[PDB]
């Protein structure tokens, strides 16, 4: 049911309208549910710094290091690797 | 050309596999010494940019060792699992450890270092 | 001695402030696999001293000229950044290890290799003769160095092109 | 009470920092969409799969406009 | 200790940061709670505090007389304004996350550390040569052609 909210956020429609896309989203997400690579937040971190340095934005590469620690400080996030692996891709 | 020593009293089921991992280290201790030497000016404007572009790969080889230690803390890294992880590194650090030993054998600088990269995944 | 304790002192040896004490930073126990990696890492901090002594000894006397200032005041914009990196590295110590530092500080092991060897090639040069000895570092070809020194030249040669747009004079 | 309001603060912080990393990387996401992609990534989902979807629905919203 | 230091850099000395009439601000001796390696960077940090104190003491004293000396001190506080403002900020950053060490605090001063030293001898030439009258508008000008962009 949560995948259908996403198709209504990106595409502005109601669930009775957009059902061909949601048919394509179940095809990809399903059968590809399990994570395929070993999970570690260290490697994904050293790739968001390496990327913001490559854009001559060396100041935000040291600000992320202060925002990635706060995530551990609060502790309401179980899988921190996944949400960063995704934010980096987009 | 580095030689290593393992152990007098160790399991034979390990030493035969240890000697299968080391050829990526000995092939590495001859690349990092090629960078720190062929960077001297008295070697031309080619043996320099060859040592720079040969350094970015060393950086990516240091990241591949970092991601292994962080994966070693959770104990998910068995010795048998190691021999498979470094395979992309055993092929690359085997190419560069062959150029860095064939550019210094016959002293090359300038064009004769750009020919060797045209005769030599 | 825990590995974390070494990560605590190394982040200071990168500046000059000393387990690791002061020409190699001889460390003084722990396993051999630790002392070796500290030695190389500690030595990078020693370089930072040689580049700091020049921009402090010559920022004292007032007889270094007008070019020798734009040089001694262009070795600082290339040091604040080295003070931003030490900022980031310290916030994560609260995780990073020795083998993780080597990749972090592999690039500033070169910029602190050209600058610490650019202030020795031009020791007694003042005036334009210094702007002519930081230009003999551009014939290098290395695309990372020739694009660093060719920036310090663009600051050091600004006072020279200030007299020109306005050669030894006699009082 | 209190520990239920201290958590709503530590989440508005993180959701504000992830929006900074999002703009310096120039992802087309906004504050509303980004809260959906974060929730999904908490349950455990391939970011190589989820990003192919977003790279597709954004690629089909133009053929309709 | 952070808020303790940020006052010592403001002009208020205490037990941790003793004050000496000749040398200047400096740390008293070794402290068990803190590390024994920091005892240096602070001493490097106080080389800045001594400047502000010896500044504001002279600014208040007004000492010699003449309007051109009054106005010089009147202006001398204006250049010294970004120093104070940049010091108020340090407390705000430390109020947010409690994981910031002295390293970051030392890093924040950066520009003030390379400015005060060059603007210290300009004052010393005045109080040591009785520069009276409009002659200040040259003694300050002869040092205005310096290379350091900030100065």
Coordinates of C-alpha atoms in Angstrom, one line a residue:
Chain A
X1 CA 0.0 0.0 0.0
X2 CA 3.0 2.3 0.6
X3 CA 4.3 1.9 -2.9
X4 CA 1.0 3.3 -4.2
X5 CA 1.4 6.6 -2.2
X6 CA 4.7 7.1 -4.0
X7 CA 3.0 6.8 -7.4
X8 CA 0.5 9.4 -6.2
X9 CA 3.2 11.8 -5.0
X10 CA 5.5 11.8 -8.0
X11 CA 2.6 11.6 -10.5
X12 CA -0.2 13.9 -9.3
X13 CA -3.2 11.6 -9.5
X14 CA -5.5 9.3 -7.5
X15 CA -5.0 5.6 -7.0
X16 CA -8.1 5.0 -9.2
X17 CA -6.4 6.9 -12.1
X18 CA -2.8 5.8 -12.2
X19 CA -2.7 2.0 -12.2
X20 CA -0.5 1.2 -15.2
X21 CA 2.6 2.7 -13.6
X22 CA 1.8 1.0 -10.3
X23 CA 1.7 -2.2 -12.3
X24 CA 5.2 -1.5 -13.4
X25 CA 6.4 -0.5 -9.9
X26 CA 5.3 -3.9 -8.5
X27 CA 7.2 -5.6 -11.2
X28 CA 10.5 -4.0 -10.3
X29 CA 10.3 -3.7 -6.5
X30 CA 9.0 -7.2 -6.3
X31 CA 11.5 -10.0 -7.1
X32 CA 14.2 -7.4 -6.2
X33 CA 13.3 -6.9 -2.5
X34 CA 16.3 -8.4 -0.7
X35 CA 19.4 -6.3 -0.5
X36 CA 22.1 -7.6 -2.9
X37 CA 25.3 -6.0 -1.4
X38 CA 26.7 -6.0 2.0
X39 CA 25.5 -3.0 4.0
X40 CA 27.9 -0.5 5.5
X41 CA 27.4 3.2 6.0
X42 CA 31.1 3.9 6.0
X43 CA 31.6 3.2 2.3
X44 CA 28.5 5.1 1.3
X45 CA 29.7 8.1 3.3
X46 CA 33.1 8.3 1.7
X47 CA 31.3 8.4 -1.7
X48 CA 29.1 11.4 -0.8
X49 CA 32.1 13.4 0.3
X50 CA 34.1 12.3 -2.8
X51 CA 31.2 13.6 -4.9
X52 CA 30.7 17.0 -3.3
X53 CA 34.5 17.5 -3.5
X54 CA 34.4 16.8 -7.2
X55 CA 32.0 19.7 -7.7
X56 CA 34.4 22.2 -6.1
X57 CA 32.0 22.3 -3.2
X58 CA 34.5 21.5 -0.5
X59 CA 32.5 23.3 2.2
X60 CA 29.4 21.0 2.0
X61 CA 31.7 18.0 2.1
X62 CA 32.6 18.9 5.6
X63 CA 29.1 19.8 6.6
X64 CA 27.7 16.4 5.6
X65 CA 30.2 14.9 8.1
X66 CA 28.4 16.9 10.8
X67 CA 25.0 15.9 9.6
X68 CA 25.8 12.2 9.3
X69 CA 26.9 12.1 13.0
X70 CA 23.6 13.6 14.2
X71 CA 21.8 10.7 12.6
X72 CA 23.6 8.4 15.0
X73 CA 23.1 10.8 17.9
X74 CA 19.3 10.5 17.9
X75 CA 18.9 6.8 17.0
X76 CA 15.5 6.5 15.5
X77 CA 16.9 5.1 12.2
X78 CA 17.6 1.4 11.9
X79 CA 18.9 1.1 8.3
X80 CA 21.1 4.2 7.7
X81 CA 22.9 2.6 4.8
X82 CA 19.7 2.3 2.6
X83 CA 18.4 5.8 2.9
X84 CA 21.9 7.3 2.1
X85 CA 22.4 4.8 -0.8
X86 CA 19.2 6.2 -2.2
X87 CA 19.8 9.9 -1.6
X88 CA 23.1 9.6 -3.3
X89 CA 21.6 8.0 -6.4
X90 CA 19.0 10.7 -6.9
Chain B
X1 CA 60.4 -8.5 -5.6
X2 CA 59.4 -8.6 -2.0
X3 CA 59.7 -11.8 0.0
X4 CA 57.5 -12.7 3.0
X5 CA 57.6 -15.0 6.0
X6 CA 54.5 -16.5 7.6
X7 CA 54.9 -18.9 10.5
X8 CA 56.9 -22.0 11.6
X9 CA 53.9 -23.4 13.4
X10 CA 50.7 -22.8 11.5
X11 CA 48.0 -24.9 9.9
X12 CA 49.0 -26.1 6.4
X13 CA 45.4 -25.6 5.3
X14 CA 46.1 -21.8 5.8
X15 CA 49.6 -21.2 4.5
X16 CA 48.8 -22.6 1.1
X17 CA 46.0 -20.1 0.8
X18 CA 48.0 -17.2 2.4
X19 CA 50.5 -17.5 -0.5
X20 CA 47.6 -17.0 -2.8
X21 CA 46.7 -13.6 -1.4
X22 CA 50.1 -12.0 -1.0
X23 CA 50.8 -11.6 -4.8
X24 CA 48.6 -8.5 -4.6
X25 CA 50.8 -7.0 -1.8
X26 CA 54.1 -7.7 -3.4
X27 CA 52.7 -6.4 -6.7
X28 CA 51.7 -3.3 -4.6
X29 CA 55.0 -2.7 -2.9
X30 CA 56.5 -2.1 -6.3
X31 CA 53.9 0.4 -7.5
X32 CA 53.9 2.7 -4.5
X33 CA 57.7 2.8 -4.9
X34 CA 57.3 3.7 -8.6
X35 CA 55.2 6.7 -7.7
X36 CA 57.5 8.2 -5.0
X37 CA 60.5 8.0 -7.4
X38 CA 59.4 8.6 -11.0
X39 CA 57.8 11.9 -9.8
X40 CA 61.3 13.5 -9.7
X41 CA 61.5 16.3 -12.4
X42 CA 64.7 14.8 -14.0
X43 CA 62.4 12.3 -15.7
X44 CA 60.5 14.3 -18.3
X45 CA 56.9 15.6 -18.6
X46 CA 55.6 12.1 -19.4
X47 CA 57.0 9.9 -16.6
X48 CA 55.2 12.4 -14.4
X49 CA 51.6 12.3 -15.7
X50 CA 52.1 8.5 -15.9
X51 CA 52.8 8.5 -12.2
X52 CA 49.8 10.7 -11.5
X53 CA 47.2 8.7 -13.4
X54 CA 48.8 5.6 -11.8
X55 CA 48.0 7.1 -8.4
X56 CA 44.2 7.4 -8.6
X57 CA 44.0 3.6 -8.8
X58 CA 46.1 3.4 -5.6
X59 CA 43.5 5.6 -4.0
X60 CA 40.7 3.3 -5.0
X61 CA 42.8 0.3 -3.7
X62 CA 42.9 2.0 -0.3
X63 CA 39.1 2.3 -0.3
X64 CA 38.8 -1.4 -1.0
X65 CA 40.8 -2.2 2.1
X66 CA 38.7 0.2 4.2
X67 CA 35.4 -1.4 3.2
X68 CA 36.9 -4.8 4.2
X69 CA 37.8 -3.8 7.8
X70 CA 34.4 -2.2 8.4
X71 CA 33.0 -5.5 7.1
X72 CA 35.4 -7.4 9.3
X73 CA 34.0 -6.0 12.5
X74 CA 30.7 -7.8 12.0
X75 CA 32.7 -11.0 11.6
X76 CA 31.2 -11.5 8.1
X77 CA 34.7 -11.8 6.6
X78 CA 36.0 -15.3 6.5
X79 CA 39.4 -16.1 5.0
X80 CA 37.8 -18.0 2.1
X81 CA 35.5 -15.0 1.6
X82 CA 38.6 -12.8 1.3
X83 CA 40.2 -14.6 -1.6
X84 CA 37.2 -13.7 -3.8
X85 CA 36.8 -10.1 -2.7
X86 CA 40.2 -8.8 -3.9
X87 CA 40.1 -10.4 -7.3
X88 CA 39.5 -7.1 -9.1
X89 CA 42.6 -5.8 -7.2
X90 CA 44.7 -8.9 -8.0
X91 CA 44.3 -8.2 -11.8
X92 CA 44.8 -4.4 -11.7
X93 CA 47.7 -4.3 -9.4
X94 CA 49.2 -7.0 -11.5
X95 CA 49.1 -4.8 -14.6
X96 CA 50.6 -1.7 -13.0
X97 CA 53.3 -3.8 -11.3
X98 CA 54.3 -4.9 -14.8
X99 CA 54.5 -1.5 -16.4
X100 CA 56.4 0.0 -13.4
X101 CA 58.9 -2.8 -13.8
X102 CA 59.2 -2.5 -17.6
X103 CA 59.6 1.3 -17.8
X104 CA 62.5 1.3 -15.3
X105 CA 64.3 -1.8 -16.8
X106 CA 65.2 0.0 -20.0
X107 CA 65.5 3.7 -18.9
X108 CA 62.6 5.4 -20.7
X109 CA 61.7 9.1 -20.6
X110 CA 59.6 11.0 -23.0
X111 CA 58.4 9.3 -26.2
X112 CA 59.9 5.9 -25.4
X113 CA 57.6 5.8 -22.3
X114 CA 54.6 6.6 -24.6
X115 CA 55.5 3.7 -27.0
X116 CA 55.5 1.1 -24.2
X117 CA 52.0 2.1 -23.2
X118 CA 50.9 1.5 -26.8
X119 CA 52.3 -2.0 -27.2
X120 CA 51.3 -3.2 -23.7
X121 CA 39.3 -5.4 -18.9
Chain C
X1 CA 47.4 1.2 24.2
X2 CA 44.1 1.2 22.2
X3 CA 43.9 2.1 18.5
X4 CA 41.5 4.9 19.3
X5 CA 44.1 6.6 21.6
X6 CA 46.5 6.8 18.6
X7 CA 43.7 8.4 16.4
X8 CA 43.4 11.0 19.2
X9 CA 47.1 12.0 19.2
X10 CA 47.6 11.8 15.4
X11 CA 44.9 14.5 14.9
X12 CA 47.2 16.8 16.8
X13 CA 50.5 15.8 15.2
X14 CA 49.0 17.0 12.0
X15 CA 49.6 20.5 13.4
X16 CA 52.8 20.4 15.3
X17 CA 51.4 19.8 18.8
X18 CA 52.6 16.4 20.1
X19 CA 52.4 9.2 22.9
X20 CA 53.6 10.7 19.7
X21 CA 56.4 13.2 20.4
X22 CA 59.0 15.1 18.3
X23 CA 63.4 14.9 13.1
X24 CA 60.8 12.1 12.6
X25 CA 57.9 12.0 15.1
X26 CA 59.3 9.0 17.0
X27 CA 56.4 7.2 18.8
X28 CA 57.0 5.5 22.2
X29 CA 53.6 -0.9 24.4
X30 CA 51.8 -1.4 21.1
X31 CA 52.1 -3.8 18.1
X32 CA 54.5 -3.2 15.2
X33 CA 51.6 -3.0 12.8
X34 CA 50.5 0.3 14.6
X35 CA 53.9 2.0 15.0
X36 CA 54.7 1.8 11.3
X37 CA 51.5 3.5 10.1
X38 CA 51.7 6.2 12.8
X39 CA 55.3 7.0 11.8
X40 CA 54.4 8.0 8.2
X41 CA 51.1 9.7 9.3
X42 CA 53.0 11.6 12.1
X43 CA 55.7 12.8 9.6
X44 CA 53.0 14.6 7.5
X45 CA 52.5 16.9 10.6
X46 CA 56.3 17.6 10.7
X47 CA 56.0 19.0 7.1
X48 CA 53.3 21.4 8.3
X49 CA 56.0 22.8 10.6
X50 CA 58.5 23.6 7.9
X51 CA 55.8 25.5 6.0
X52 CA 54.6 27.2 9.2
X53 CA 58.1 28.4 10.3
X54 CA 58.6 30.3 7.1
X55 CA 55.2 32.0 7.2
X56 CA 56.0 33.0 10.8
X57 CA 59.7 33.9 10.7
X58 CA 59.3 36.1 7.6
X59 CA 56.0 37.6 8.9
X60 CA 58.2 39.2 11.6
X61 CA 60.9 41.3 9.9
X62 CA 59.6 44.3 7.9
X63 CA 62.5 44.1 5.4
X64 CA 61.0 41.3 3.2
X65 CA 59.5 43.6 0.6
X66 CA 56.2 43.7 -1.2
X67 CA 56.4 40.5 -3.1
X68 CA 57.6 38.5 -0.1
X69 CA 54.3 39.5 1.5
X70 CA 51.9 38.4 -1.2
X71 CA 53.8 35.1 -1.1
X72 CA 53.8 34.8 2.7
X73 CA 50.1 35.9 2.6
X74 CA 49.3 33.3 -0.1
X75 CA 50.7 30.4 1.9
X76 CA 47.8 31.1 4.3
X77 CA 44.9 30.7 2.0
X78 CA 46.4 27.3 1.2
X79 CA 46.5 26.6 5.0
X80 CA 43.0 27.6 6.1
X81 CA 41.8 24.8 3.9
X82 CA 44.2 22.5 5.6
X83 CA 42.6 23.7 8.8
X84 CA 39.1 22.9 7.4
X85 CA 40.1 19.3 6.8
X86 CA 41.4 18.9 10.4
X87 CA 38.0 20.2 11.5
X88 CA 36.0 17.5 9.6
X89 CA 38.4 14.7 10.7
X90 CA 37.9 15.7 14.4
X91 CA 34.1 15.6 14.3
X92 CA 34.2 11.9 13.3
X93 CA 36.6 10.8 16.1
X94 CA 33.7 10.8 18.6
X95 CA 34.1 6.1 13.3
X96 CA 37.5 6.3 11.6
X97 CA 40.7 4.2 12.0
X98 CA 44.4 4.3 10.9
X99 CA 43.7 2.5 7.6
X100 CA 40.8 4.9 7.0
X101 CA 43.0 7.9 7.5
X102 CA 45.5 6.9 4.7
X103 CA 42.8 7.4 2.1
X104 CA 41.5 10.6 3.7
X105 CA 44.9 12.2 3.9
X106 CA 46.5 10.8 0.7
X107 CA 45.9 14.0 -1.3
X108 CA 47.0 16.6 1.4
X109 CA 50.3 14.5 1.5
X110 CA 51.1 16.1 -1.9
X111 CA 50.0 19.7 -1.5
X112 CA 52.0 19.6 1.8
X113 CA 54.8 18.2 -0.4
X114 CA 55.0 20.9 -3.0
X115 CA 54.5 23.8 -0.5
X116 CA 57.0 22.4 1.9
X117 CA 59.5 22.1 -1.0
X118 CA 58.5 25.5 -2.6
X119 CA 59.6 27.5 0.5
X120 CA 63.1 25.9 0.4
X121 CA 63.9 26.6 -3.3
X122 CA 63.2 30.3 -2.6
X123 CA 64.9 31.1 0.7
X124 CA 66.9 34.3 0.3
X125 CA 65.0 35.7 -2.7
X126 CA 63.2 39.0 -2.1
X127 CA 61.4 41.2 -4.5
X128 CA 61.0 40.1 -8.1
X129 CA 63.8 37.5 -7.8
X130 CA 61.3 35.5 -5.7
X131 CA 58.5 35.9 -8.3
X132 CA 61.1 34.3 -10.7
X133 CA 61.9 31.4 -8.4
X134 CA 58.2 30.4 -7.9
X135 CA 57.9 30.4 -11.6
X136 CA 60.6 27.8 -12.1
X137 CA 58.2 25.3 -10.5
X138 CA 55.7 25.5 -13.3
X139 CA 57.9 23.5 -15.8
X140 CA 56.8 20.3 -14.2
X141 CA 54.0 18.8 -16.3
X142 CA 52.3 17.1 -13.4
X143 CA 48.7 18.3 -13.9
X144 CA 48.1 18.5 -10.2
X145 CA 51.2 20.6 -9.3
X146 CA 51.3 22.8 -12.4
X147 CA 47.7 23.9 -11.6
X148 CA 48.6 24.7 -8.0
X149 CA 51.9 26.6 -8.4
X150 CA 50.4 28.4 -11.4
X151 CA 48.0 29.9 -8.9
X152 CA 50.5 31.1 -6.3
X153 CA 52.3 32.7 -9.2
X154 CA 49.1 34.6 -10.0
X155 CA 49.2 36.1 -6.5
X156 CA 53.0 36.7 -6.2
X157 CA 53.2 38.4 -9.6
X158 CA 50.4 40.9 -8.7
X159 CA 52.7 43.4 -6.9
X160 CA 55.3 43.1 -9.7
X161 CA 52.6 44.0 -12.2
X162 CA 51.7 46.8 -9.9
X163 CA 55.0 48.6 -10.3
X164 CA 55.0 47.9 -14.1
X165 CA 51.6 49.4 -14.7
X166 CA 52.8 52.4 -12.6
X167 CA 64.3 47.2 -12.3
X168 CA 66.5 48.4 -9.4
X169 CA 66.1 52.0 -8.3
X170 CA 68.8 54.2 -6.7
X171 CA 67.9 56.4 -3.7
Chain D
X1 CA 4.9 14.0 27.2
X2 CA 8.6 14.9 26.7
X3 CA 10.4 11.9 25.1
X4 CA 7.6 12.0 22.5
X5 CA 8.4 15.7 21.7
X6 CA 12.2 15.2 21.8
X7 CA 11.9 12.7 19.0
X8 CA 9.8 15.0 16.8
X9 CA 12.6 17.5 17.1
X10 CA 15.4 15.1 16.3
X11 CA 13.5 14.1 13.1
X12 CA 12.8 17.6 11.9
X13 CA 16.5 18.2 12.2
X14 CA 17.6 15.2 10.1
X15 CA 14.9 15.8 7.6
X16 CA 16.3 19.3 7.3
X17 CA 19.9 18.2 6.8
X18 CA 19.0 15.6 4.2
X19 CA 17.3 18.4 2.3
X20 CA 20.6 20.3 2.2
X21 CA 22.5 17.3 0.9
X22 CA 19.7 17.1 -1.6
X23 CA 20.1 20.5 -3.1
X24 CA 23.9 20.6 -3.3
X25 CA 23.6 17.4 -5.2
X26 CA 20.8 19.0 -7.4
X27 CA 18.3 16.1 -7.1
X28 CA 15.0 17.3 -8.3
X29 CA 13.3 16.1 -5.1
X30 CA 11.5 18.4 -2.7
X31 CA 10.6 18.2 1.0
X32 CA 7.4 16.3 0.5
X33 CA 8.7 13.6 -1.9
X34 CA 11.9 13.2 0.0
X35 CA 10.0 12.1 3.1
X36 CA 8.6 9.2 1.1
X37 CA 11.9 8.0 -0.1
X38 CA 13.4 8.1 3.4
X39 CA 10.6 6.0 4.9
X40 CA 11.0 3.3 2.2
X41 CA 14.8 3.2 2.8
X42 CA 14.2 2.5 6.5
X43 CA 12.4 -0.8 5.9
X44 CA 15.2 -2.0 3.7
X45 CA 14.9 -1.6 -0.1
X46 CA 17.4 -1.7 -3.0
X47 CA 18.3 1.9 -3.8
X48 CA 19.4 0.6 -7.2
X49 CA 15.8 -0.5 -7.7
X50 CA 14.0 2.4 -6.1
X51 CA 16.0 5.0 -8.1
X52 CA 15.2 3.2 -11.4
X53 CA 11.5 3.8 -10.6
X54 CA 11.9 7.5 -9.9
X55 CA 14.1 7.8 -13.0
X56 CA 11.1 6.4 -14.9
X57 CA 8.0 8.0 -13.5
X58 CA 9.8 11.3 -14.0
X59 CA 10.6 10.2 -17.5
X60 CA 6.9 9.4 -18.2
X61 CA 5.4 12.6 -16.6
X62 CA 6.8 14.5 -19.6
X63 CA 5.1 12.4 -22.3
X64 CA 1.8 13.3 -20.7
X65 CA 2.5 17.0 -20.1
Chain E
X1 CA 35.7 25.0 29.7
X2 CA 34.6 26.2 26.3
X3 CA 32.5 29.1 27.7
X4 CA 35.4 29.6 30.1
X5 CA 37.8 30.1 27.2
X6 CA 35.5 32.3 25.2
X7 CA 35.6 34.7 28.1
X8 CA 39.3 34.5 28.4
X9 CA 39.5 35.5 24.7
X10 CA 37.2 38.4 25.5
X11 CA 39.3 40.2 28.2
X12 CA 38.4 38.4 31.4
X13 CA 41.1 36.3 33.0
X14 CA 40.5 33.6 35.5
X15 CA 42.1 30.7 37.5
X16 CA 42.6 28.5 34.4
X17 CA 44.0 31.4 32.3
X18 CA 46.1 33.6 34.6
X19 CA 47.1 37.1 33.6
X20 CA 50.6 38.6 33.9
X21 CA 51.4 42.3 33.4
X22 CA 54.5 41.7 31.3
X23 CA 54.2 38.4 29.4
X24 CA 50.4 38.2 28.7
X25 CA 47.7 35.6 28.8
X26 CA 48.9 32.1 29.3
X27 CA 47.8 28.8 30.8
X28 CA 48.8 28.2 34.4
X29 CA 50.1 24.6 34.4
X30 CA 49.1 21.0 33.5
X31 CA 45.4 20.1 34.1
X32 CA 44.5 16.4 34.7
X33 CA 41.0 16.5 33.1
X34 CA 42.3 17.8 29.8
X35 CA 45.2 16.3 27.7
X36 CA 48.8 17.4 28.2
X37 CA 49.2 18.2 24.4
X38 CA 46.5 20.9 24.3
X39 CA 48.7 23.0 26.8
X40 CA 50.4 24.3 23.6
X41 CA 47.5 25.3 21.2
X42 CA 46.0 27.4 24.0
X43 CA 49.3 29.2 24.4
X44 CA 49.2 29.7 20.6
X45 CA 45.5 30.9 21.1
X46 CA 46.4 33.3 23.9
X47 CA 48.9 35.1 21.7
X48 CA 45.7 36.6 20.2
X49 CA 44.0 37.4 23.6
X50 CA 47.0 39.3 24.8
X51 CA 46.5 41.6 21.7
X52 CA 42.8 42.3 22.4
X53 CA 43.5 43.1 26.1
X54 CA 46.5 45.3 25.3
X55 CA 44.3 46.9 22.6
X56 CA 41.2 47.7 24.8
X57 CA 43.4 48.8 27.7
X58 CA 45.0 51.4 25.4
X59 CA 41.7 52.2 23.8
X60 CA 40.2 53.1 27.1
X61 CA 43.3 54.9 28.4
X62 CA 43.3 57.3 25.4
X63 CA 47.1 57.5 25.8
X64 CA 50.0 62.2 24.5
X65 CA 46.8 63.9 23.4
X66 CA 45.2 65.4 20.3
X67 CA 42.1 64.8 18.3
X68 CA 44.0 62.7 15.7
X69 CA 44.8 60.3 18.6
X70 CA 41.1 60.3 19.8
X71 CA 39.8 59.5 16.3
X72 CA 42.4 56.8 15.8
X73 CA 41.1 54.9 18.8
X74 CA 37.6 55.8 17.7
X75 CA 38.3 54.0 14.4
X76 CA 40.4 51.3 16.0
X77 CA 37.3 49.8 17.6
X78 CA 35.6 49.6 14.2
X79 CA 38.2 47.3 12.7
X80 CA 38.1 45.3 16.0
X81 CA 34.3 44.8 15.6
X82 CA 34.3 41.7 13.4
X83 CA 36.6 40.1 16.1
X84 CA 33.9 40.4 18.8
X85 CA 31.1 39.4 16.5
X86 CA 32.9 36.3 15.3
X87 CA 33.5 35.4 18.9
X88 CA 29.8 35.6 19.9
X89 CA 29.1 33.1 17.1
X90 CA 31.5 30.4 18.6
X91 CA 29.1 30.0 21.6
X92 CA 26.1 29.4 19.3
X93 CA 27.8 26.6 17.4
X94 CA 28.8 25.0 20.7
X95 CA 25.3 25.4 22.1
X96 CA 24.0 23.2 19.2
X97 CA 26.2 20.1 19.1
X98 CA 28.3 19.2 22.2
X99 CA 30.9 17.2 20.2
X100 CA 33.0 20.2 19.1
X101 CA 36.6 20.3 20.5
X102 CA 39.2 23.1 20.9
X103 CA 40.5 22.2 17.5
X104 CA 37.4 23.7 15.8
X105 CA 37.4 26.7 18.1
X106 CA 41.1 27.4 17.3
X107 CA 40.2 26.9 13.5
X108 CA 37.4 29.5 13.7
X109 CA 39.8 32.4 14.7
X110 CA 41.9 31.8 11.6
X111 CA 41.8 35.4 10.1
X112 CA 42.2 37.2 13.4
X113 CA 45.4 35.2 14.2
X114 CA 47.1 36.6 11.0
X115 CA 45.7 40.2 11.4
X116 CA 46.4 41.4 15.0
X117 CA 50.2 40.7 14.8
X118 CA 50.6 43.1 11.9
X119 CA 48.3 45.7 13.5
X120 CA 50.2 45.5 16.9
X121 CA 53.4 47.3 15.9
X122 CA 51.5 50.2 14.5
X123 CA 50.3 50.9 18.0
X124 CA 53.8 50.3 19.4
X125 CA 55.4 52.9 17.2
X126 CA 52.9 55.5 18.5
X127 CA 53.4 54.9 22.2
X128 CA 57.2 54.6 21.8
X129 CA 57.9 57.7 19.7
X130 CA 55.4 60.3 20.9
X131 CA 53.8 60.6 17.5
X132 CA 51.9 63.9 18.1
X133 CA 49.6 65.7 15.6
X134 CA 48.7 65.0 12.0
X135 CA 51.9 63.0 11.6
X136 CA 49.8 59.9 12.4
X137 CA 48.1 60.2 9.0
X138 CA 51.5 59.2 7.5
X139 CA 52.7 56.7 10.1
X140 CA 49.5 54.8 9.5
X141 CA 49.8 55.4 5.8
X142 CA 53.4 54.1 5.5
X143 CA 52.0 50.8 6.9
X144 CA 49.0 50.9 4.6
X145 CA 51.1 49.9 1.6
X146 CA 51.6 46.4 3.1
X147 CA 51.2 43.2 1.1
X148 CA 48.8 41.3 3.4
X149 CA 45.4 41.8 1.8
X150 CA 43.5 41.7 5.1
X151 CA 45.8 44.4 6.6

